[PDB]
Amino acid sequence: TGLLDGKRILVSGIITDSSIAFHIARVAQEQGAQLVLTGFDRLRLIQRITDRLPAKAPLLELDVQNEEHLASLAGRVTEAIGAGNKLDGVVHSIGFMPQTGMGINPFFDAPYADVSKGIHISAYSYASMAKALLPIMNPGGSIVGMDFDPSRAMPAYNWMTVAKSALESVNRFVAREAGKYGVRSNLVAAGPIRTQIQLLEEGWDQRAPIGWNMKDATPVAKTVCALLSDWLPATTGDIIYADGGAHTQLL
Amino acid sequence: TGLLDGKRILVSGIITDSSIAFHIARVAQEQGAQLVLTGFDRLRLIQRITDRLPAKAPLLELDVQNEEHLASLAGRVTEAIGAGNKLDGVVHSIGFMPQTGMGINPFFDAPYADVSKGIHISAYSYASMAKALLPIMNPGGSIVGMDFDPSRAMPAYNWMTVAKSALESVNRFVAREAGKYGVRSNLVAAGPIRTLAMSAGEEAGAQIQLLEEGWDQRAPIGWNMKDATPVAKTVCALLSDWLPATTGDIIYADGGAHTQLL
Amino acid sequence: TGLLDGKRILVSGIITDSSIAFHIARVAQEQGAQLVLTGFDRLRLIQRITDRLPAKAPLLELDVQNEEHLASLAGRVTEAIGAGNKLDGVVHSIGFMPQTGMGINPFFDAPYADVSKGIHISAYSYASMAKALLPIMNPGGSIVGMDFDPSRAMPAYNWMTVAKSALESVNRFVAREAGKYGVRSNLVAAGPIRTLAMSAIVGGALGEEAGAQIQLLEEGWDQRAPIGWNMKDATPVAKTVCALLSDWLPATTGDIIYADGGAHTQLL
Amino acid sequence: TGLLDGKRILVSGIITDSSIAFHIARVAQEQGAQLVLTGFDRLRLIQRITDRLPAKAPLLELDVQNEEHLASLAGRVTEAIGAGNKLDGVVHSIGFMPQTGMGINPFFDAPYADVSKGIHISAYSYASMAKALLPIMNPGGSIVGMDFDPSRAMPAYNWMTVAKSALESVNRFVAREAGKYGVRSNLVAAGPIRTLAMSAIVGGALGEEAGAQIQLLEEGWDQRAPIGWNMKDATPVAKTVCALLSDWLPATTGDIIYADGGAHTQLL
Ligand SMILES: NC(=O)c1ccc[n+]([C@@H]2O[C@H](COP(=O)([O-])OP(=O)(O)OC[C@H]3O[C@@H](n4cnc5c(N)ncnc54)[C@H](O)[C@@H]3O)[C@@H](O)[C@H]2O)c1
Ligand SMILES: NC(=O)c1ccc[n+]([C@@H]2O[C@H](COP(=O)([O-])OP(=O)(O)OC[C@H]3O[C@@H](n4cnc5c(N)ncnc54)[C@H](O)[C@@H]3O)[C@@H](O)[C@H]2O)c1
Ligand SMILES: NC(=O)c1ccc[n+]([C@@H]2O[C@H](COP(=O)([O-])OP(=O)(O)OC[C@H]3O[C@@H](n4cnc5c(N)ncnc54)[C@H](O)[C@@H]3O)[C@@H](O)[C@H]2O)c1
């Protein structure tokens, strides 16, 4: 008798068993949700990985930069869940920024084509996914995406931080559209998960009043399932921080 | 089978059956929680209201301005839940600001005696409750307070808004103390709710009506000010195990109004 | 003697005499700044307009999507201002989102080619300008870009709101780079100003539904603002940008100054 | 010809010549301002200190907790500046939390009697001053208060952080009331400044641990700040206050300007 019993939920973003979306999927199933999964590029590898979930679930291909993939998605989901059935939840757990805009490469050296690809995949796609899927979502449903707090600049993350700032703004507009379908849209801002950079991750655990385990994706997956559930029915266009409370503390 | 099965939860601030705390209590019990209730001043009448709840729960007296009430609280809760047992949740649903600091009385005309009392009860008491009860709380536990978004000023609410701003800062420090016990501390920022207080000058009501109509239109999923259940349910989410990495934070149960400009 | 007496300040984004940049340039000049102006595309149209400023200034061509314009910008500015001289201020007053991303067009119907162009021009370009010009900036210098508060969603602004969220994040990163030169970086978040594009939307050009939305946004701004807001008057915004170009906010960087009548601090 | 030429400005909160208010007063006087000062308790020590300002100014007594001092303030200021004259600027640089609420003491051990005193002095008194002074303020006038960013919890500051949170909210209401007079109300959020009480804690007055926490805070501030942060130097903060009292930020009210080297805009 689980949190998400009899809910139909789409989960994107699994590439490995340490992917945040793997753990979102694992916990959702453990809570009685029936899943449809989406994957990008290495679909052979991803079938392998999704087999490790506790229950079978169909795996659809979705490259968020492919307009055909997006145009046909609602139909393909409906064939996999069965006509007359609709989704109750959608999980966006997709993000990418080329190495020129993330890492040791100076901020000013990122060419715009790279930044733009990163923003397409990491931010614009959240609207793309909601566009495709809202027509096949039931009232009371929920769309959740994955955020990393971009309110302050930080070393290394650079243009990925910019892209997450874009995502948060995207999420607010998607909530206006989702509202029309009685559907909620929110992001979970997670702490750093091991799916300058080490000094940033070590600072997290000390700021977090309850600590932060960067090797454990479960507290993040649980928070996403909270948002997929009926238990936060008045929250939309918002961000829930699953970060051990680190963003609430200066030192 | 319930969201809060076998959890022991203290719930303060029930005065009428339209109190937000009444509805947190009702939903908590529907979800298998075993409750201890606290009440201020009007305890006989408060029993006459809590009788209407789904299950029996002990009612203790607690005036958060009374130092003895606070010093004796851990003990009286421990007598009510049985020695060797500790609370898994605490709900602060306590707020007050005298007429001088809220309504049609000019902002500048509220005396500090009134403002200080308002802040004591509405903000400082969150720290008081956490002090008294953290020693009798289980790891994985959760303290939750009730907030009204004070990020932007608004007509009428005046010094009450100032007090909620204080509360949000208190919440972040209470989170530091609660962390030591593996306990979380969060606030739910509710949209406006028609309790007996809100259902009570002339231009004051008009600005409050404008505030509330504005809330529902801004809220992408709408806002029913007559329905406390969405707020209660959000408080139960936080009392549950499903938000275990969130502390010193604010969850908005406001229909998403605060995320929209128009 | 004036607020910016002796400062050399590059000001971009003049297209008409209702441009926010026109007013920034005017006020800067009234306060003793020596300007270099940059313009996009219609340079002869812009020359006619810049002739209406209190003083003359060199006008250079800068299309922020042109990588060669950017590569040559510092060399060309040095020519204009005299070799051995450097800039003390740079104003980015450049923004653009195609009508597919901003207006009556539904949020979900904006194709990514159009969004990406608008982000290149409205957000990324702030980093581009900083990259090109920081090498010719003096310590205690100031880069100011224009912003429109994207903290909460709103009708019509749509993907321009998203581009301003990006811009806020870019400014925080530009501040880190600018810090190495002793140069500060901030945005001025303005209230709605009746420039060319905003005049068009009100009055029907995109239909009565779009015209009504924006009129409700504007009227709501003035009433929320404790000192009121005059959408017809860019001077208070220009003065704010000049504040930030001066030496009077020397410890503010990576930040946003709101010149919006205080509207964003009030709910109703 | 200076920033505040001929403006009449009340400046509260001078105690020593390292006080933030002392530097605000000095800079305001350097920029041609005509001052009226207010002081608390040790009015003998304060007279001595204010005599070290560049120009003479009337010194009135003001204990913000005294209701008679507030009820008479307007009348006493008027007597000091001349009948038919009004104030253009008011500076609130008054803050206090007893050691039970700030320092090494556990957060939960602050009695409310001490917290309430700190909130009275540090937050409510921003409302009280504006109530007393707005009726003798000119349109285009400015009230400016002092803030320390309370958005995130931090060790030691405890209930003063809470007070600053209440101050920020108070400021947004004061803006509403001041707007009716054509007057702006803003707070300046400063980085840590080595004033009397701070220099003590770093010297070891409060012990090993308080000294080590404040030293960690200051170090981190300077590294987070892209332009750095010199805690010995109050001048950037004083300048920022003067910017706000001037006519150069005329569309900013109910707001917070950060004079913190940009530290609050960077995580690491
Ligand atoms: N790991 C962290 O520290 C952290 C922190 C905060 C937020 N997040 C976010 O969580 C989400 C998931 O990332 P993760 O840490 O689980 O890493 P991950 O590498 O497992 O997942 C990223 C996913 O994005 C997908 N993707 C990339 N390009 C795509 C395209 N063109 N079309 C469709 N999908 C595409 C990949 O297939 C991959 O499954 C991301 O949005 C990430 O930015 C991660
Ligand atoms: N109703 C709304 O619109 C709204 C919106 C957001 C947040 N809130 C907050 O939610 C909480 C609950 O308020 P409500 O709307 O349920 O109104 P309510 O009047 O039903 O409840 C307020 C409670 O505060 C208690 N209280 C007052 N003084 C006390 C003291 N000295 N000691 C202990 N308790 C004391 C009262 O007895 C009462 O039970 C408050 O903090 C309120 O500020 C209310
Ligand atoms: N008008 C408002 O209500 C308002 C409110 C807040 C902020 N802003 C911002 O102020 C800035 C100025 O806008 P405005 O209202 O003065 O309108 P405007 O049209 O006068 O300014 C836009 C300028 O951007 C320039 N531009 C467009 N593409 C360019 C390119 N590829 N390279 C270089 N320049 C290019 C245009 O030529 C024009 O000079 C923008 O950043 C805008 O987003 C405007």
Ligand SMILES: NC(=O)c1ccc[n+]([C@@H]2O[C@H](COP(=O)([O-])OP(=O)(O)OC[C@H]3O[C@@H](n4cnc5c(N)ncnc54)[C@H](O)[C@@H]3O)[C@@H](O)[C@H]2O)c1
């Ligand atoms: N690190 C810092 O020093 C720092 C950082 C940010 C903000 N601030 C703020 O700047 C302001 C000035 O503080 P400072 O560092 O110059 O300290 P300071 O001690 O130099 O000045 C504080 C002033 O508060 C006055 N005061 C206390 N109780 C009073 C009362 N009842 N009536 C009138 N005045 C009273 C004192 O007389 C004193 O002049 C305060 O609000 C402070 O919180 C300080």
Ligand SMILES: Cc1csc([C@](C)(O)c2n[nH]/c(=N/C(=O)Cc3c(F)cccc3F)s2)n1
């Ligand atoms: C924030 C803001 C408000 S007005 C503004 C700018 C710089 O003037 C604009 N940039 N891009 C703009 N784009 C549009 O208005 C979309 C649009 C057009 F670009 C052209 C015709 C109609 C139309 F609706 S307006 N930026």
